[PDB]
Design an enzyme around this catalytic site. Structure first.
Site, PDB file in Angstrom:
ATOM      1  N   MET A  38       6.948  80.469 100.939  1.00 49.57           N
ATOM      2  CA  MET A  38       7.629  80.635  99.648  1.00 49.57           C
ATOM      3  C   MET A  38       8.975  79.845  99.690  1.00 49.57           C
ATOM      4  O   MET A  38       9.542  79.378 100.780  1.00 49.57           O
ATOM      5  CB  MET A  38       7.525  82.048  98.953  1.00 49.57           C
ATOM      6  CG  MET A  38       8.983  82.430  98.507  1.00 49.57           C
ATOM      7  SD  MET A  38       9.171  83.832  97.390  1.00 49.57           S
ATOM      8  CE  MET A  38      10.571  83.158  96.474  1.00 49.57           C
ATOM      9  N   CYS A  39       9.343  79.501  98.468  1.00 50.35           N
ATOM     10  CA  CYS A  39      10.420  78.665  98.195  1.00 50.35           C
ATOM     11  C   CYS A  39      11.498  79.635  97.610  1.00 50.35           C
ATOM     12  O   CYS A  39      11.542  80.843  97.868  1.00 50.35           O
ATOM     13  CB  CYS A  39       9.973  77.632  97.179  1.00 50.35           C
ATOM     14  SG  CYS A  39       8.459  76.700  97.579  1.00 50.35           S
ATOM     15  N   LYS A  40      12.378  79.133  96.774  1.00 44.58           N
ATOM     16  CA  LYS A  40      13.391  80.065  96.407  1.00 44.58           C
ATOM     17  C   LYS A  40      13.018  81.429  95.638  1.00 44.58           C
ATOM     18  O   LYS A  40      11.927  81.632  95.032  1.00 44.58           O
ATOM     19  CB  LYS A  40      14.526  79.300  95.715  1.00 44.58           C
ATOM     20  CG  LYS A  40      14.193  78.332  94.589  1.00 44.58           C
ATOM     21  CD  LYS A  40      15.374  77.472  94.371  1.00 44.58           C
ATOM     22  CE  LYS A  40      15.429  76.844  92.987  1.00 44.58           C
ATOM     23  NZ  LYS A  40      16.899  76.793  92.602  1.00 44.58           N
TER      24      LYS A  40
END
EC number: 5.3.99.2
Length: 158
Positions: A38-40
């Site tokens: 996952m990213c932000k």
């Protein structure tokens, strides 16, 4: 229920976070989060006085976006989230944050089939949480009854 960050300042909580660790009593939830790059997360105020929490993650060649509405629950720092797919509502609390580095969240089911669900979440302002913050998260998870095997650090869902 559980403690809320005292004197919580919602505007200092806004902006970009990284979901760096989780613990839950749902094994499928832990396993899937751990598998995801996952990213932000991005926290922004919602029209109802609460927050929109928008998380992004990679699948195949694309970055998917998901937004959760955290409605105010009547003490600053505590929210409620309604999940129509699960037919359930959950309490979400910011238990502790320093705003500039980390936040410890705790969620539990409140109504519906999801009533028994529990999850602790570590948010970090950077993608590399320091060792002391990982140790603070483990100790916070143990204070909530989570066993070590239920505690996952997200390598890069983070």
């Amino acid at each position: 229920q559980v403690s809320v960050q005292p004197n919580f300042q919602q505007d200092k909580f806004l902006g970009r976070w990284f979901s760096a660790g989780l613990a839950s009593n749902s094994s499928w939830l832990r396993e899937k989060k751990a598998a995801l790059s996952m990213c932000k997360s991005v926290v922004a105020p919602a029209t109802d006085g609460g927050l929109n929490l928008t998380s992004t993650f990679l699948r195949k060649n694309q970055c998917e976006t998901r937004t959760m509405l955290l409605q105010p629950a009547g003490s600053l720092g505590s929210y409620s989230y309604r999940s129509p797919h699960w037919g359930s509502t959950y309490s979400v609390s910011v238990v502790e944050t320093d705003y500039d580095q980390y936040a410890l969240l705790y969620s539990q089911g409140s109504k519906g089939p999801g009533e028994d669900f529990r999850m602790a979440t570590l948010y970090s302002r950077t993608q590399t949480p320091r060792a002391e913050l990982k140790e603070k998260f483990t100790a916070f998870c143990k204070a909530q009854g989570f066993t070590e095997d239920t505690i996952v650090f997200l390598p890069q869902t983070d």
